[PDB]
């Protein structure tokens, strides 16, 4: 079957859902209308120790977003989290 990672995004739980909301505003504080863009993601990239170009993150936003905005919204941010969070089974 398909849509396995998004199924958890739609359901999930308030404990993890509200957590993505609290971890989303800090990621995008001044990006367009509250959407994590290449510049916002690059800010956290420097904390790890790497400073890639805006194109590196532009590919990341295209893989999880394709609605025309080209920016990680609250849903796309939480959807990208479960992708690398794996499942419980």
């Amino acid at each position: 079957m398909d849509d396995i990672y998004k199924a958890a995004v739609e359901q999930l739980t308030e404990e993890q859902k509200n957590e993505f909301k609290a971890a989303f505003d800090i990621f995008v504080l001044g990006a367009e209308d509250g959407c994590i863009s290449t510049k916002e993601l690059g800010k956290v990239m420097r904390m790890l120790g790497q400073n890639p170009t805006p194109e590196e993150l532009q590919e990341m936003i295209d893989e999880v977003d394709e609605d025309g905005s080209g920016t990680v919204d609250f849903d796309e941010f939480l959807v990208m989290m479960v992708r690398c969070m794996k499942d419980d089974s």
């Binding site: 957590e19 956290v44 904390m47 590196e56 479960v82 969070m85």
Partner: peptide, 20 residues
């Protein structure tokens, strides 16, 4: 290439690495 981020890893650096 050293480009990879995890949910817990990014969260720990978001509200932990010089943040909280």
């Amino acid at each position: 290439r050293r480009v990879r981020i995890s949910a817990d890893a990014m969260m720990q650096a978001l509200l932990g690495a010089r943040a909280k």
